[PDB]
Amino acid sequence: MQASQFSAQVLDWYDKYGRKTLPWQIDKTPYKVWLSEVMLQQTQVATVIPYFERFMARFPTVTDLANAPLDEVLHLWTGLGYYARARNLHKAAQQVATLHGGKFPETFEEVAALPGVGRSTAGAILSLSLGKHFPILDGNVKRVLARCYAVSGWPGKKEVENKLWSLSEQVTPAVGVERFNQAMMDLGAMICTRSKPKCSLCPLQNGCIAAANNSWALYPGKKPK
Amino acid sequence: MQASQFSAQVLDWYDKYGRKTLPWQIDKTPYKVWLSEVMLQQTQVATVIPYFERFMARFPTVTDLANAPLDEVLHLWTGLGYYARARNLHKAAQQVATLHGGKFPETFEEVAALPGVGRSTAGAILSLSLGKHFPILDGNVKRVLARCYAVSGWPGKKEVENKLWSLSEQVTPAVGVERFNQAMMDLGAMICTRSKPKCSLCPLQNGCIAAANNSWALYPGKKPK
Ligand code: SF4
Numbered sequence: 001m002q003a004s005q006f007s008a009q010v011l012d013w014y015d016k017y018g019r020k021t022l023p024w025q026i027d028k029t030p031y032k033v034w035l036s037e038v039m040l041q042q043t044q045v046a047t048v049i050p051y052f053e054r055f056m057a058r059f060p061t062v063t064d065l066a067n068a069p070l071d072e073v074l075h076l077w078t079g080l081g082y083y084a085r086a087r088n089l090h091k092a093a094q095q096v097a098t099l100h101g102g103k104f105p106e107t108f109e110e111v112a113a114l115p116g117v118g119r120s121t122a123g124a125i126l127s128l129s130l131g132k133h134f135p136i137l138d139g140n141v142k143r144v145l146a147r148c149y150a151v152s153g154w155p156g157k158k159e160v161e162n163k164l165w166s167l168s169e170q171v172t173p174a175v176g177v178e179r180f181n182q183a184m185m186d187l188g189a190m191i192c193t194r195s196k197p198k199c200s201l202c203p204l205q206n207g208c209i210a211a212a213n214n215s216w217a218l219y220p221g222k223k224p225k
Numbered sequence: 226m227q228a229s230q231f232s233a234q235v236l237d238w239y240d241k242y243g244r245k246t247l248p249w250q251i252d253k254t255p256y257k258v259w260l261s262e263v264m265l266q267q268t269q270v271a272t273v274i275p276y277f278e279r280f281m282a283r284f285p286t287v288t289d290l291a292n293a294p295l296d297e298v299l300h301l302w303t304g305l306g307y308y309a310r311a312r313n314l315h316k317a318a319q320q321v322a323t324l325h326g327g328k329f330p331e332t333f334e335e336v337a338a339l340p341g342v343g344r345s346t347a348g349a350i351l352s353l354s355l356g357k358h359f360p361i362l363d364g365n366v367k368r369v370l371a372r373c374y375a376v377s378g379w380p381g382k383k384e385v386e387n388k389l390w391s392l393s394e395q396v397t398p399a400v401g402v403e404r405f406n407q408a409m410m411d412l413g414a415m416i417c418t419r420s421k422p423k424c425s426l427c428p429l430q431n432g433c434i435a436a437a438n439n440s441w442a443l444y445p446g447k448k449p450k
Pocket residue numbers: 143144147148191192193197198199200202203204205206208209210211216
């Protein structure tokens with residue numbers, strides 16, 4: 001499957017099966033996408049949705065979040081777990097208020113420099129909210145690409161991570177990047193699941209090596225020892 | 226648990242756990258709620274969402290739906306199953322165009338007279354879209370009320386159905402009815418499930434007879450024979 005076929009297939013699927021009615025998909029902005037990405041990274045969507053809504057109501061802009069006392073932020077976070085995310089969230093908001101005039105930055109290096117934001121989260125923020133042409137590589141994406149392309153290694157190894165980023169870059173289009181990147185996360189979350197993926201429901205099933213060999217359990221590699 | 230406590234508990238739960246970002250909860254109208262109720266009645270939400278979106282895009286108003294050829298309606302329905310719903314949908318749209326000037330009716334008797342719309346669907350349409358004070362009684366609601374109140378009988382029997390409607394009427398508030406009725410369906414769909422309900426996550430657990438006796442399997446009564 002040529003990379004142009006991969007993204008065409010994924011975009012066609014997203015058109016007919018995607019949903020873009022999550023609250024961080026309505027009236028999308030860099031702030032909303034960042035907030036949602038941080039919440040989602042160690043929490044399931046069903047649980048995040050009411051927290052997202054409460055945070056957007058209490059903190060309509062990144063400057064409101066920055067000016068709030070940290071204890072109020074932690075209190076609103078209560079129940080999401082992994083509170084280093086909340087502490088980095090608040091620091092990042094403060095850095096946006098201080099360094100960027102309260103306007104969430106729209107260029108990659110400035111986004112990636114925020115506390116709590118890595119390369120994938122920065123490309124997610126800018127691709128999903130502004131259609132900028134960046135690939136992503138969260139756990140969902142890693143599982144889809146590692147299965148399709150038979151990446152055996154543990155992504156905790158630098159060369160394996162690098163191989164996965166190269167594959168992501170290869171399949172990520174510029175045209176329709178916001179749809180493609182949302183679709184890849186939705187696929188990884190709902191279809192290409194950690195256990196017993198639903199390959200018959202997958203738009204990649206015709207080219208996926210794991211599907212061909214019923215070998216999804218091999219990919220990605222797990223932590224060796 | 227007094228009925229005023231029941232609806233207070235449910236409304237408090239909905240406030241903190243509800244989500245009102247489904248596409249038929251945004252910019253709600255009688256048309257949108259009707260369409261979604263018909264689709265949902267024999268189809269799971271995950272499957273309905275892309276169909277709802279396609280129907281709203283193709284048919285922004287009930288008059289567009291009425292003027293479309295039936296074959297196009299059936300073709301767009303393809304995959305939802307239970308196509309008598311689609312045939313009644315189109316007839317109902319035509320009856321709205323013909324009898325009600327293309328304005329989806331906002332009074333109970335006119336709504337309930339539409340093909341495909343019963344007493345519960347009519348109260349759902351008007352309560353959810355306009356805050357009118359009508360109770361509902363779909364399968365989700367029946368399961369929550371029958372468990373809470375130990376209604377042993379099969380709701381296919383008229384007296385049992387009547388008992389369930391009386392209970393629904395008793396707990397349904399006027400203030401906050403749109404939230405209460407959405408919350409009761411969400412509870413029945415996600416928490417008070419047909420199998421192994423999640424009672425520890427349920428706002429009624431402190432007064433529910435089924436929870437008290439771990440006897441949810443008895444309620445509602447199943448079809449005798
Ligand atoms: S075909 Fe199966 S293993 Fe391959 S990407 Fe799709 S869901 Fe995953």
